[PDB]
């Protein structure tokens, strides 16, 4: 989609026609987008121990307490800030975790990305073409009282859950809700953003699963993502189509 699709996505976040999205916001979002890729370049070579010691996560005790209760946890977050840096922080402060990635094309580029995240200490499952269904591995991780992390605000396929997002229809993956219902794992929304020259991260209160309804739960997740993106609009680098009307 590139910058023009980014402008159109920011138009929803901010409630204005694409043409009226503030110039300063478009600028900051492109700078934020550039920063992610500049950090991805060097992140495998940074001092991960130092980063784990010196960065903080607001309300990380949410997660720790879910793991003290033996429940496992689903950390669901949007494409904001540098989520790979948060992953480094979790690897250093808790240990390796499991996640999931679209099997991009070409396979050589997919492998580049796998190597990148594996060098950060993550276990990355292919969304397609792996030995086992990713869901089933994830559920086994949760039942072993482990955290999993899922990028959770975009899934524009037939099986994605339709939710309202900044007042308009989009689709988000059902996995986070499905996994929490099936395993009892706590479903924590997470947000990452850029905090000056550093990184801001927060774990939010777990989502109520009493409804047993994937669509209601995913809507609550979307609502929290929308509130967090609204706080740091420039850090949500969604340059791909997000809302259904843009497909
Ligand atoms: C604040 C608590 C720790 C949060 C850690 C979250 C780590 C997220 C890691 C995601 C890795 C996969 C991202 C690539 C997927 C894609 O966009 O195709
Ligand atoms: Mg309840």
């Amino acid at each position: 989609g590139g910058p023009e699709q980014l402008r159109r996505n920011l138009a929803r976040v901010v409630g204005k026609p694409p043409a009226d999205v503030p110039d300063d916001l478009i600028r900051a979002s492109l700078a934020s987008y550039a920063r992610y890729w500049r950090e991805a370049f060097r992140l495998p070579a940074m001092d991960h121990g130092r980063l784990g010691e010196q960065l903080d996560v607001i309300d990380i005790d949410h997660l720790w307490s879910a793991l003290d209760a033996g429940r496992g946890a689903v950390l669901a977050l949007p494409h904001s800030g540098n989520w790979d840096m948060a992953g480094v922080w979790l690897v250093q402060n808790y240990g390796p975790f499991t996640t999931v990635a679209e099997r991009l094309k070409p396979e050589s580029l997919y492998r580049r990305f796998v190597e990148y995240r594996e060098s950060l200490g993550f276990e990355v499952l292919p969304l397609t073409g792996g030995e086992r269904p990713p869901f089933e591995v994830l559920a086994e991780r949760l039942t072993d009282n482990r955290p999993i992390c899922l990028m959770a605000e975009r899934d524009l396929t037939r099986s994605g859950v339709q939710v309202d997002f900044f007042g308009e229809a989009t689709r988000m993956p059902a996995g986070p809700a499905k996994l929490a219902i099936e395993t009892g794992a706590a479903l924590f929304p997470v947000h990452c953003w850029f905090e000056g020259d550093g990184w801001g991260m927060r774990v939010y209160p777990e989502l109520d699963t009493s409804s047993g309804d994937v669509t209601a739960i995913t809507q609550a997740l979307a609502d929290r993502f929308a509130a967090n993106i609204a706080t740091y609009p420039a850090d949500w680098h969604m340059l791909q189509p997000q809302w259904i009307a843009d497909l």
Side-chain angles (χ1 to χ4, degrees), residues 106-130 132-146:
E107 177 73 25
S108 25
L109 179 65
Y110 169 79
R111 243 48 114 98
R112 225 289 184 288
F113 274 104
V114 170
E115 256 192 0
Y116 162 63
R117 301 203 152 92
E118 286 192 343
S119 75
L120 307 184
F122 319 164
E123 186 192 10
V124 184
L125 306 184
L127 183 47
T128 66
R132 316 219 296 118
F135 183 98
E136 280 174 30
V137 184
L138 296 178
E140 283 168 22
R141 299 283 181 275
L142 296 171
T143 58
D144 194 38
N145 189 34
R146 289 166 182 282

Side-chain angles (χ1 to χ4, degrees), residues 36 56-58 60 63-64 75-77 79 82-91 97-104 113 117 122-124 148-151 190-192 201-203:
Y36 171 84
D56 296 294
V57 181
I58 295 169
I60 190 65
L63 174 61
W64 299 161
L75 304 166
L77 50 114
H79 291 79
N82 188 339
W83 51 87
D84 293 323
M85 179 62 73
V88 167
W89 187 94
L90 187 62
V91 167
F97 64 91
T98 308
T99 179
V100 104
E102 170 171 85
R103 194 152 199 161
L104 304 158
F113 274 104
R117 301 203 152 92
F122 319 164
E123 186 192 10
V124 184
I148 69 165
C149 305
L150 298 171
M151 311 305 297
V190 168
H191 203 62
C192 312
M201 302 168 281
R202 170 170 181 194
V203 180

Side-chain angles (χ1 to χ4, degrees), residues 205-222:
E206 71 173 302
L207 298 183
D208 187 15
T209 54
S210 282
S211 72
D213 189 338
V214 169
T215 72
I217 294 166
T218 304
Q219 185 61 77
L221 183 60

Side-chain angles (χ1 to χ4, degrees), residues 2 4 40 51 68 103 108 115 125 153 156 159 161 172 174 221:
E4 198 116 69
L51 292 161
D68 290 339
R103 194 152 199 161
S108 25
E115 256 192 0
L125 306 184
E153 96 277 42
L156 302 159
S159 196
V161 181
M172 298 190 178
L221 183 60

